[PDB]
Structure prediction request, 227 residues.
Amino acid sequence: GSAHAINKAGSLRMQSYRLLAAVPLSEKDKPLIKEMEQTAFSAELTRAAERDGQLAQLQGLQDYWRNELIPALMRAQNRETVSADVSQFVAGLDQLVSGFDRTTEMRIETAAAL
Amino acid sequence: GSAHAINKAGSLRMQSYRLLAAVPLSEKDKPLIKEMEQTAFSAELTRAAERDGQLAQLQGLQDYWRNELIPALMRAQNRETVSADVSQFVAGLDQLVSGFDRTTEMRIETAAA
Prediction:
């Protein structure tokens, strides 16, 4: 399971820039927001963050995504009004995925011994 | 390791759309292109692809990136002329990542069994 979770968490970075590339958003992009919602709040990602010592970080990303990022993205009439918000979100995701990395690689390489 | 290669290969998906979101590109974006080049041809991804049986797939994506995708992104005046090409390349990367991911898992399960 650890591997799939790194894939899925990393994919939120792509999904972030994919929504930016679609700005200004139309009704046709609702499926992309629901897909990103499903990924970001999946039990799979939460379980991964718990195992890897990153729950607080994941929660922060989730909160800002629902309460600032998405509303900003849906309000944006041009990419400039939200491009800095998205670049930083992807940097925060980079820290989360990097965190999943350290812990995950370790758990795999020490699966023996334990 | 493997977990790290899934992160790095996955990042190419984000890097592809970050370049689309910058269209029309300018000199200010040249670092974005070099960074994607560094990631796509890194010794880490190459070794991971070799170990996981995805080297031909990686090589194909590398060739497409160099011969078709970057040239297309550089000449685009608007996102509409190259957005489908970008999403397509990302689906090809999705398969590379899914490969790394499943093989890594399969290794896990073999150890388990």
The CA atoms of residues 2 and 84 of chain A lie 30 Å apart. Residues 1-114 of chain A form a domain with the Four Helix Bundle (Hemerythrin (Met), subunit A) fold (CATH 1.20.120.960). Chain A has one domain: 1-114. Chain A touches chain B at residues 1-4, 6-7, 10-11, 13-14, 16-18, 20-21, 23, 79, 83, 86, 90, 94, 97-98, 100-101, 104-105, 108-109, 111 (CB under 8 Å).
